[PDB]
Design an enzyme around this catalytic site. Structure first.
Site, short mmCIF file in Angstrom:
data_model
loop_
_atom_site.label_atom_id
_atom_site.label_comp_id
_atom_site.label_asym_id
_atom_site.label_seq_id
_atom_site.Cartn_x
_atom_site.Cartn_y
_atom_site.Cartn_z
N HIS A 10 0.81 -1.22 0.00
CA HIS A 10 0.00 0.00 0.00
C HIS A 10 0.85 1.28 0.00
CE1 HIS A 10 0.20 1.08 4.30
NE2 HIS A 10 -0.06 -0.19 4.63
N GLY A 37 2.52 5.88 10.43
CA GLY A 37 3.94 5.72 10.13
C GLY A 37 4.51 4.38 10.58
N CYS A 97 3.40 1.36 9.74
CA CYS A 97 3.25 0.34 8.69
C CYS A 97 4.60 -0.16 8.23
CB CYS A 97 2.43 0.88 7.53
SG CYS A 97 0.72 1.30 7.97
#
Ligand SMILES: O=C(Nc1cnccc1C1CC1)[C@@H]1CCNc2cc(Cl)c(Cl)cc21
Ligand SMILES: [Cl-]
Lengths: 302, 297
Positions: free
Chosen positions: B41, B135, B137
């Site tokens: 993503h 942040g 991820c």
């Protein structure tokens, strides 16, 4: 979202753990630059532990009596000195993995990460706090002596604790990295006992603000309290007195949530009176006191 | 003595964390050999979005050093960025997919910089009760087996209840989740029964015996009680796994089950077990044995 008991990444400390052997005793040491720090009781026998004269035991030692092992490499001891209850072993190699560091002495209520080690090998990392009675509720087995407590702010490791012993109740006592014990403890096998422990009030309030920040408001109420009335009630539940310094420290969290410190204090008073009534706050059925105002701000905001 | 929620030492994983920026999105990547793994993503028709990006669109930063991307491919929900430099800090590793109830350590990162480490369990509903902010991820979950890091989780998203969803390192999500902006909800969670029993054995090992009783139960009668309290069924495999702890403490697994059954029906009565007023289910039988024996890495 979420709130966990979170430890600092232990990498910077792992690269400092060495094994220190003196006679039959093996424990952990902290290798920073060309010095290895470890508990001075490594020079003791179990027959010496009651009333050891460390100066007398140390004077009989030579550099080659201390075997220091960094991984599969034996370091050479070229000097030795004692500073309070820590032994400082000067070695012939500076640790290339030495991070940016400081030795800090913490106050009760302060939290830190513990890198539990056995035979100079790190086995786990956990979070804990210096209890008001100067003990820590750690998880240590025989051989963990010399395991260290630390905080990592920015890229600097602040060493605040070195594990020395377990008290009869299963709690732990140790020193700062200058060898000064936290609490009225001595590195002697004499009958010592931890004082009655109390709850870290400012930490519970910080944790209630963390719960509000994560959407939990069920425990809030329409009441406020004076600082003195709060302390009179909270002392009856074995809670540490809340000082004006604690109220000031909670200021940012109060501003962020819109709940005055003395209003949060009234919610705490009610929680102590009622209990949780089958409810939880941040996944806990007990009031959590091992998160400081600084830990809450760091984790809930950045 | 003592019993703490303990994570594996994070050093071997810290040396793998990099920052990955693509357009306006910045998240974390895992640098192993010459590949950087991160959530896809960071770039929805992910084949269509990926074909429009070139190597120089992905900015990868390892500390204060920019790595150059020389290739890119997608495997399930993970993006694999081939870089010119092999990570000299690459540890001995494996990509393992874990089962619900298994625990792992999470090294939470922001901008390729590790900020904290905590111990998690993969819930029976395939979510993790983590602690993540924007942040995070690309933050990873791992276990350490001797000197080998087994990567088992990569963080992708937060569900509306505040719980987290992610994939194994091969990009396969844990749970019925997708990496798209749509209505997704965690299923009803259950308690990891074998883990609660392991934690009761840890309590006995640390001197807490108040909850023990003279009674035993059958596996069927216990499982009828487990279903009533939203506890996962206990299998004969779980009973076998608990064997060493049963031998060490002298309390048969079904003997401890009667203790658990009485705790579920009657509560703790103002008491605690290992400093907790709730039955803790994020320690496996192996975690209990490791912490109550001192295994090192
Ligand atoms: O306490 C100790 N070790 C330990 C640490 N942490 C956790 C469990 C242990 C061992 C009990 C298992 C050591 C050895 C035993 N006696 C002792 C006495 C004195 Cl005065 C000092 Cl300074 C250190 C020790
Ligand atoms: Cl402090």
């Amino acid at each position: 979202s979420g709130f966990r008991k979170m430890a600092f990444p232990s990498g910077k400390v792992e690269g400092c753990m060495v094994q220190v052997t003196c006679g039959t005793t093996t424990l952990n040491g902290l290798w920073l630059d060309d010095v290895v720090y470890c508990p001075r009781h490594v020079i003791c026998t179990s027959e010496d532990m009651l009333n050891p004269n460390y100066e007398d035991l140390l004077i009989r030692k030579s550099n080659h009596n201390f075997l220091v092992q960094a991984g599969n490499v034996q370091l050479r001891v070229i000097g030795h000195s004692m500073q309070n209850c820590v032994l400082k072993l000067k070695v012939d190699t500076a640790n290339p993995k030495t991070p940016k560091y400081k030795f800090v002495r913490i106050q009760p209520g302060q939290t830190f990460s513990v890198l539990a080690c056995y035979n100079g090998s790190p086995s786990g990392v956990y979070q804990c706090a210096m209890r008001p009675n100067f003990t820590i509720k750690g998880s240590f087995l025989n051989g963990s002596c010399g395991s260290v407590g630390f905080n990592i702010d920015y890229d600097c490791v602040s060493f605040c604790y070195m594990h020395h012993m377990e008290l009869p109740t299963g709690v732990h006592a140790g020193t700062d990295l200058e060898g000064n014990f936290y609490g009225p403890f001595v590195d002697r096998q004499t009958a010592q006992a931890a004082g009655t422990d109390t709850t870290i009030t400012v930490n519970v309030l910080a944790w209630l603000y963390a719960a509000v920040i994560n959407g939990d408001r069920w425990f809030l109420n329409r009441f406020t309290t004076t600082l003195n009335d709060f302390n009179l009630v909270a002392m009856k539940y074995n809670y540490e007195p809340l000082t004006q310094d604690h109220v000031d420290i909670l200021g940012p969290l109060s501003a962020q949530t819109g709940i005055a410190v003395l209003d949060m204090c009234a919610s705490l008073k009610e929680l102590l009176q009622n209990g949780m009534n089958g409810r939880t706050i941040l996944g806990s059925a007990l009031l959590e006191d091992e998160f400081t105002p600084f830990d809450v701000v760091r984790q809930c905001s950045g």
